A paper describes a structure:
Despite the biological significance of these two glycosyltransferases involved in pathogenicity and avoidance of the host innate immune response, their structures and the molecular basis of their activity have not been investigated. This study reports the crystal structures of [name] and [name] from [name] as well as multiple structures of [name] in complex with its substrates (for example UDP, N-acetylglucosamine or SDR peptides), products (glycosylated SDR peptides) or phosphate ions. In addition to the dimerization role, the inserted domain was found to serve as a binding platform for the SD repeats before and after glycosylation. Altogether, the extensive snapshots of [name] complexes in multiple states provided a mechanistic insight into how [name] recognizes and glycosylates the clustered serine residues in the SDR proteins.
Residue numbers in the entry: 0 to 307, 312 to 317, 321 to 384, 388 to 500
The structure:
């Protein structure tokens, strides 16, 4: 029996969902339950994006599966340059300021080659031209080395059809496209599998065929990128058990629990709930709201999305670990410091993150004369050891691995009471305080009270240590183990 965690891809910078999938894989591995990540989109770099985090046997990508390239690792290097020069007798001309070569048979321009690296060891693509210098085809190479896909062009370099190959060069898939709103859209997919041909109209139907090929009685699927994975599981039989995993708030308007439309990315899953064995959410609080909303039609279970040097060697250092985005309302932390510096002149606030609001934050900093007090700082382990308190002033939240980590480092926190995440990781007067949303006066008062009472900060710090230890690896392993056991027994 195999547990499959179905996402979309891995990027160069891992998203929240991708991290959650990899963290879950690692727990299942420690546990001794077989698990694999399952990826859906064609991504000829996937093997490189994955290398830092999972091995090749830890994942199955859909395109790899049908291209007979699952579990394949990197080919020994190949010097395309020498082969073109010495064995094909072509003429190479380097393109200034790049990794690209133009390729010629004497006076005739044949190809434009692009390498990933300055050393020309990783061929990326090769464009082909006809006698009129029309670009008729593009060859896309997998980072492992093999030619993965050829794309046939028409008119102004528009995508008409694509052919996907195994490492030996055999065609395994074909995709035909038509343009809508200026972009190519799949209209047909042919797959060569099991010595037959199979036909589909879109990638959702291809995905559903792929799930069906993977499944054996005893296996369990987890739907993690539901915008794509729910329409796929909807086209598969109910004999295949699948758990839906929510990674964010489930409705567009958190303040209308009963009537708000579901998030567009979850609509397909919620509109077909009886397909799913359960739903997993990261917080007890979101669990209660979703159960109510779906009238308990399937089980909802909260399982955190992750688990938890010298400590508290204490200037008064406040910290904020938060994207610089409007929902985070980081300007309020500036306003808090503006008010607190009069009473606390050795105060500092360090804001770790990035985003479109940095400009305005710097302007307010300069406006208030706080340049030696408030820092936009852009691994946070050394940053925690002297942190007095964390601040959260957001108007909406999710379960925060960042907050988990600062709590493991003994750093207490004062947060607005907003859904979801703060109530999960903060117990008032134990490891921090929860403040009525947008009540900046209560925020000031509570922040000042912890600054004026270091013995209170210390108790809160010791409670932060204690709170983090409830999220240990071994407690997560036990939650996951019990959940899978139970889910398979009921199915």
């Amino acid at each position: 029996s195999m547990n499959y965690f179905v996402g979309n891809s891995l990027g160069v910078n891992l998203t929240g969902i991708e991290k959650a999938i990899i963290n879950r894989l690692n727990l299942f591995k420690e546990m001794g339950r077989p698990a694999q990540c399952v990826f859906l989109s064609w991504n000829r770099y996937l093997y490189r994006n994955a290398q830092n985090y999972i091995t090749s046997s830890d994942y199955i990508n859909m395109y790899d599966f049908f291209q007979e390239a699952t579990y394949l690792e990197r080919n020994e290097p190949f010097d395309w340059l020498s082969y073109w020069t010495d064995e094909c007798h072509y003429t190479l001309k380097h393109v200034e300021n790049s990794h690209d070569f133009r390729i010629y048979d004497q006076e005739r321009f044949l190809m434009y080659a692009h390498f990933q690296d300055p050393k020309y060891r990783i061929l990326d693509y090769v464009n082909h031209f006809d006698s009129q210098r029309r670009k008729v085809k593009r060859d896309f190479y997998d980072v492992r080395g093999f030619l993965s896909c050829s794309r046939i062009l028409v008119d102004k370099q528009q995508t008409l059809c694509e052919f996907f190959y195994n490492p030996e060069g055999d065609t395994k898939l074909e995709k035909y496209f038509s343009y809508k709103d200026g972009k190519p859209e799949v209209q047909k997919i042919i797959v060569y599998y099991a010595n037959k041909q199979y036909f589909f109209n879109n990638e959702t139907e291809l995905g559903a065929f792929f799930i069906k090929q993977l499944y054996q009685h005893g296996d369990l699927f987890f739907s993690d990128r539901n915008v794509y994975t729910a329409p796929i599981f909807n086209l598969t039989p109910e004999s295949i058990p699948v758990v839906a995993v929510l990674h964010s708030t489930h409705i567009k308007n958190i303040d209308a629990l009963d009537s708000s439309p579901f998030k567009n990315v979850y609509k397909a899953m919620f509109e077909n709930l009886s397909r799913y064995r359960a739903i997993i959410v990261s917080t007890e609080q979101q669990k209660l709201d979703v159960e109510k909303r779906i009238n308990h039609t399937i089980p909802v279970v909260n399982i955190p999305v992750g688990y938890s040097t010298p400590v508290q060697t204490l200037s008064v250092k406040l910290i904020s670990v938060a994207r610089y985005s409007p929902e985070k309302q980081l300007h309020q932390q500036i306003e808090l410091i503006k008010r607190l510096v009069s009473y606390v002149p050795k105060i500092e606030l360090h804001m770790y993150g990035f985003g479109s609001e940095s400009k305005k934050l710097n302007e307010l900093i300069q406006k208030y004369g706080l340049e030696n007090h408030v820092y936009l700082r852009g691994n946070l382990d050394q940053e925690y050891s002297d942190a007095y308190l964390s601040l959260i002033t957001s108007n909406m939240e999710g379960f925060s691995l960042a907050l988990l980590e600062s709590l493991a480092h003994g750093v207490p926190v004062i947060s607005y009471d907003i859904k979801y995440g703060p109530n999960e990781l903060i117990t008032s007067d134990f490891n921090g305080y929860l403040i009525t949303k947008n009540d900046e006066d209560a925020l000031f008062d509570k922040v000042k009270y912890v600054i004026d009472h270091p013995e209170v900060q210390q108790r809160l710090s010791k409670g932060s240590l204690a709170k983090a230890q409830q999220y240990s690896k071994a407690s997560l392993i036990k939650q996951w183990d019990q959940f899978v056991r139970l889910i398979l027994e009921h199915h």
